[PDB]
Amino acid sequence: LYFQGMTEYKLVVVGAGGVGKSALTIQLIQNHFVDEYDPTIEDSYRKQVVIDGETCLLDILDTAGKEEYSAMRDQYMRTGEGFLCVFAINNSKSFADINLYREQIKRVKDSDDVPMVLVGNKCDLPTRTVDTKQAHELAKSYGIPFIETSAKTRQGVEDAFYTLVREIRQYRMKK
Numbered sequence: 713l714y715f716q717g718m719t720e721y722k723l724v725v726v727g728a729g730g731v732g733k734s735a736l737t738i739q740l741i742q743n744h745f746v747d748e749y750d751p752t753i754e755d756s757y758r759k760q761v762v763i764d765g766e767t768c769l770l771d772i773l774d775t776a777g778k779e780e781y782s783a784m785r786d787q788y789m790r791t792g793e794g795f796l797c798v799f800a801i802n803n804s805k806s807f808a809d810i811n812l813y814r815e816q817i818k819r820v821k822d823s824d825d826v827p828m829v830l831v832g833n834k835c836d837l838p839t840r841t842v843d844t845k846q847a848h849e850l851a852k853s854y855g856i857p858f859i860e861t862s863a864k865t866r867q868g869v870e871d872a873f874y875t876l877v878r879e880i881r882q883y884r885m886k887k
C-alpha cells in the first residue's frame with residue numbers, strides 16, 4: 713500500500729487505439745498536449761501528487777489500444793489496481809470497445825468490483841457521436857464514475873485520474 717510512507721496507487725489507462733490515453737497521461741504528468749499520434753506499446757510514469765490531503769505515489773501504466781499488442785493485457789490487468797476506461801466522444805467504435813476491456817479486467821482479476829472510471833475524451837471537438845447521457849447511462853449501470861475530458865484543454869483530466877484514486881481508496885477502506 714505504501715512507498716516511503718506515501719500511498720501507492722497503480723492506475724492503468726485502457727481503451728481503443730487513438731482515444732487519447734497517452735495525451736491524457738502526458739497532460740497529467742507533464743502539463744502539455746501531444747498533437748502527434750505515436751501509437752503506444754506500453755509506457756509507465758510515476759508522479760507524486762496530493763489528492764484530498766493525502767500524499768500519493770501514482771504509477772500510471774499507459775497501455776496499447778492497437779490489437780497487435782494484446783498479449784501484454786493479462787500482465788497489466790493482474791498488477792493494475794484501478795482502470796481508466798477511455799473512449800473518444802467522436803468515435804462510436806471506441807465506445808463499443810469499452811466492455812471488451814472491462815470484461816477482460818474482471819476475468820483476469822476474478823472480481824466484479826475492480827475500481828474503474830469511464831472517460832469520454834476529446835470533449836473539445838465539435839463532431840460528437842457519443843452523447844453525454846448515453847455514456848452516463850452506461851456508467852450508471854456499471855456503478856462507476858463517468859468523466860468527460862479533453863487532453864487538449866485539460867478539462868476533466870485531473871478529475872478523471874483523481875476520481876480513480878478516490879475509488880481505489882474507498883475500495884481499500886472497505887477492507
Ligand SMILES: Nc1nc2c(ncn2[C@@H]2O[C@H](COP(=O)(O)OP(=O)(O)OP(=O)(O)O)[C@@H](O)[C@H]2O)c(=O)[nH]1
Binds near residue numbers: 731748749750837
Ligand atoms: N482534439 C483532441 N485531440 C486529442 C485529444 N486527446 C488526444 N487527441 C489526439 O488524438 C491522437 C491520438 O491520441 P493518443 O494519446 O496518441 O492516443 P492513444 O489512445 O494513446 O493511442 P494508442 O497508444 O495507439 O492506443 C493524437 O493526434 C492526439 O493529439 C483530445 O482531448 N482532444
Ligand SMILES: Nc1nc2c(ncn2[C@@H]2O[C@H](COP(=O)(O)OP(=O)(O)OP(=O)(O)O)[C@@H](O)[C@H]2O)c(=O)[nH]1
Binds near residue numbers: 777
Ligand atoms: N480488452 C480487449 N480489447 C479488445 C479485444 N478485441 C479487440 N479489442 C479492442 O478493440 C479494438 C477493435 O475493436 P473495433 O474498434 O470494433 O475494431 P474492428 O472493427 O474490430 O477493427 P479495426 O477497425 O480494423 O481496428 C482493438 O484495437 C482493441 O483496442 C479483446 O478481446 N479484449
Ligand SMILES: [Mg+2]
Binds near residue numbers: 733734735750752
Ligand atoms: Mg498511446
